[PDB]
C-alpha cells in the first residue's frame, strides 16, 4: 500500500453534502462508498440518492439510524440504487419512492474489513476506494473541529454513533491520519472534512465497522 493516498484528488469523491437534522449519515456514507467504485468501474463520478436508502432500506431506521451493510445488502437484492437527481435529498422519511429508471448503479453485495484492524482499513483503502467507516463522533471536539489530526482521549470506540467516509490516509507534521469525507455540510470541519488520528489504538472506533460494496 502507498504511504499516503487521497482518492478526492483522484476523481472517486463527489462533493461533500449535508444531511441535515436526519439521522441518515449511514445513508450517506453507503452513497460515498458506492459512488467511488462507480467512479473505479465505469470511470462516472455521480451523485447516488441518500434518500433512496433512507426511504427504502426497510430494517434500518430511516432518520433514526442504521447499517451501511444493510444499505448495501439493499442495492444488491434491489438490482439497483437512484441517482441523487433521480430521487433528491429531503432529510426526512417519506414511503419508497425508488424508481429503476433513474438507476444509476448496483451492487454484488459487500465486503467487512476485520473488526479494529487499522492495517486492514489501510489496504482496503488503497486497493479498493473509498471505505464507510463508523466512528464516536459525539465529543465537543470532533463537533468542532477545524485543522490538524483529530484525537480526543475522550472518544469511545464502544460507541459507534456516526457513519463518515475513509477518502485516504496520510501524515502531518509526523502524525498519522485519516481523510475523513463528513456529511455535516462544506462549513464544517475543515471544507467538510476531517483528520484523524491513525494507528492510535483505533481511535473513536474508526475500524470498528468498516465495509465496501462489490459492485
Ligand atoms: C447518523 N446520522 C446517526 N448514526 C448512525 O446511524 C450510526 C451509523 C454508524 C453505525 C451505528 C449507527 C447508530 O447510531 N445506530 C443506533 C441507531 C440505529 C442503528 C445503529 C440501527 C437502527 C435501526 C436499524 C439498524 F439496522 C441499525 N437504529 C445518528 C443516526
Redesign the pocket.
Known amino acids: 500500500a502507498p504511504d499516503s493516498v487521497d482518492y478526492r484528488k483522484k476523481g472517486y469523491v463527489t462533493p461533500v453534502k449535508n444531511?441535515g437534522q436526519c439521522?441518515?449519515?449511514?445513508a450517506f456514507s453507503s452513497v460515498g462508498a458506492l459512488e467511488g467504485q462507480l467512479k473505479k468501474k465505469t470511470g462516472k463520478l455521480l451523485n447516488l440518492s441518500p434518500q433512496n436508502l433512507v426511504d427504502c432500506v426497510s430494517?434500518?431506521?430511516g432518520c433514526?439510524?442504521?447499517?451501511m451493510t444493510?444499505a448495501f445488502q439493499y442495492v444488491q437484492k434491489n438490482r439497483g440504487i437512484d441517482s441523487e437527481d433521480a430521487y433528491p435529498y429531503v432529510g426526512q422519511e417519506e414511503s419508497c419512492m425508488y424508481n429503476p429508471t433513474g438507476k444509476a448503479a448496483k451492487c454484488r453485495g459487500y465486503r467487512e474489513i476485520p473488526e479494529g484492524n487499522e492495517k486492514a482499513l489501510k489496504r482496503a483503502v488503497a486497493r479498493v476506494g473509498p471505505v464507510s467507516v463508523?466512528i464516536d463522533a459525539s465529543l465537543t471536539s470532533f463537533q468542532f473541529y477545524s485543522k490538524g489530526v483529530y484525537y480526543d482521549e475522550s472518544c469511545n470506540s464502544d460507541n459507534?454513533?456516526?457513519?463518515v467516509l475513509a477518502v485516504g490516509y496520510g501524515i502531518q507534521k509526523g502524525n498519522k491520519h485519516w481523510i475523513i469525507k463528513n456529511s455535516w455540510g462544506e462549513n464544517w470541519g475543515n471544507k467538510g472534512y476531517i483528520l484523524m488520528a491513525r494507528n492510535k489504538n483505533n481511535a473513536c472506533g474508526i475500524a470498528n465497522?468498516a465495509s465496501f460494496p462489490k459492485m
Open positions: 444531511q439521522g441518515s449519515c449511514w430494517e434500518n431506521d433514526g439510524g442504521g447499517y444493510n463508523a459507534l454513533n456516526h457513519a465497522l
